[PDB]
Design a binder for this molecule. Structure first.
Ligand SMILES: Nc1ccc(C(=O)NCC(=O)O)cc1
Length: 489
């Protein structure tokens, strides 16, 4: 097939336009995943006195305690709280009083959000195989736009949580289908590079969230501004071209020929396409015309690899989403810390790339995960008074975790046999999403100990780094094709 696609311009007009317009939506992906840092921030709040020096007990720091009002000039504060308006004019926390006793709800919502992402990874994955990549992409654009706009207009917390879960489902569908439709339309010799570009467009997305949230501090307007471009995306995405590989797989080669002829003229190489007919299409497409995930558990050689890669994905995503969404405690302005976090990835990916090529694949994962864990533990131990040390160490941890996300992507792409390679791509990635469902929840345990969430957030990556030992080195080795090749290693 690559033959034909190449025969049809290879990369060119239809390819540059579609690639740019399918990767453009991912610029807002990172803004949606990490939105609750700016739309759900906690301003310093104090108890509203009966309708402050007399009416507010003071804590060690001298500041007014947040959740206690003197019974007489203590008692649970039931008259509401005067949230500070200095920064964050309004965040869900302020709007729906998600503080004090219910403070945990602030995390719960995000958990629910990524729950949708996990669901959006599965259901809208299966739909992608039944209705076509383009139709599912169109529905994802429409669902993201509508759900985000409605969540910006939620009248109470449960509706906001449900609509954010729908937003997560639709955005996970977007993330999967953009990559799939982009890979399936490009030649293999430029497929891997596309993935790299994907990551970069995700990374730059963080910068966007740093900027927009500065200009639009209100949470409702920020949510609407972030989720409204998806309406224009749904408006312009009716013009996409269905992936011809899916059309061939479903058995409708007529639509494959139609799409190939359409890309032909688009690319200007019509005479070639026009020559491409049903007989030639069948002749060059007969040979191409994945095993079950149960095989991953059943085969012990595959079971060991699945367990190791699941632990790596889970730990990496868990620590990453633990660090990305703790921005206020570093002591610097959260917009600046967001800009810095976005800027870590560009050199972090280069360092990971260089290490992966030079030293190896397994040592790169080991070093990245162990460094992330040690940075995390030392951030947990170093007192808050040292601001530059905590900021630098958290930044280094985030960079190491981004390098891990890539290293584990490449590692799990080259480790699995070709029969189960794509399914292993899914479940491993699925484990990552499962990690991001557990990451906020464990955060809730803070009320127990201020530093416990960081302690677990670093204990898990160290365990993953230790687990990495069992994995086999893949540098200089061809990709495997069967279980026997794995056993030979
Ligand atoms: N280069 C990156 C790609 C994806 C992610 C991520 O957050 N993935 C979770 C999911 O989208 O299910 C992070 C960095």
């Amino acid at each position: 097939f690559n033959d034909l696609l190449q025969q049809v311009g290879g990369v060119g007009r239809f390819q540059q336009i579609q690639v740019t317009l399918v990767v453009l939506p991912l610029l807002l992906m990172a803004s949606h995943n990490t939105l609750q840092n700016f739309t759900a921030a906690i301003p310093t709040h104090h108890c509203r006195p009966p309708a402050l020096e007399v009416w507010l007990p003071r804590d060690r720091q001298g500041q007014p305690e947040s959740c206690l009002r003197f019974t007489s000039p203590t008692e649970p504060c039931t008259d509401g709280w005067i949230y500070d308006n200095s920064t964050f004019p309004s965040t869900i926390v302020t709007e729906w009083d998600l503080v004090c006793s219910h403070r945990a709800l602030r995390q719960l919502a995000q958990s629910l959000y990524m729950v949708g992402v996990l669901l959006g990874a599965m259901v809208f994955g299966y739909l992608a195989d039944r209705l076509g990549r383009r139709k599912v992409l169109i529905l994802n654009y429409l669902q993201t736009a509508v759900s985000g706009t409605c969540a910006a207009f939620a009248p109470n917390f449960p509706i906001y949580c449900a609509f954010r879960l729908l937003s997560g489902m639709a955005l996970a569908g977007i993330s999967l289908n953009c990559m799939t439709l982009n890979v399936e339309w490009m030649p293999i010799h430029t497929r891997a590079c596309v993935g790299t570009l994907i990551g970069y467009v995700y990374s730059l997305g963080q910068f966007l969230l740093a900027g927009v949230a500065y200009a639009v501090p209100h949470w409702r307007h920020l949510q609407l501004l972030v989720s409204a471009p998806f309406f224009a995306f749904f408006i312009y995405s009716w013009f996409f071209i269905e992936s011809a590989r899916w059309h061939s797989s479903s058995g409708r080669l007529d639509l494959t020929l139609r799409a190939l002829q359409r890309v032909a003229r688009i690319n200007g190489k019509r005479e070639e396409g026009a020559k491409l007919s049903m007989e030639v299409l069948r002749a060059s497409l007969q040979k191409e015309l994945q095993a079950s995930a149960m095989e991953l558990l059943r085969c012990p050689t595959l079971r060991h690899l699945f367990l190791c890669l699941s632990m790596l994905w889970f730990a990496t995503s868990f620590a990453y989403y633990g660090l990305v969404m703790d921005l206020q405690g570093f002591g610097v302005s959260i917009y600046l810390i967001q800009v810095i976090f976005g800027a870590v990835d560009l050199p972090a990916k280069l360092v990971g790339f260089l290490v992966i090529n030079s030293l190896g694949r397994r040592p790169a994962q080991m070093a990245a995960l162990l460094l992330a864990g040690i940075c995390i533990l030392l951030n947990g131990v170093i007192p808050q008074d040292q601001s530059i040390v905590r900021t630098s160490l958290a930044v280094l941890g985030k960079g190491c975790l981004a390098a891990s996300f890539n290293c584990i992507f490449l590692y799990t792409g080259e480790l699995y046999p070709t029969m189960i390679r794509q399914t292993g791509m899914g479940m491993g990635s699925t484990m990552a999403r499962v990690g991001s469902i557990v990451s906020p929840l464990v955060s809730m345990t803070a009320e127990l100990y201020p530093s416990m969430p960081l302690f677990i957030y670093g204990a898990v990556p160290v365990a993953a780094s230790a687990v990495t030992v069992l994995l086999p080195e893949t540098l200089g080795q061809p990709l495997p094709d069967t279980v026997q090749d794995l056993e030979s290693r």
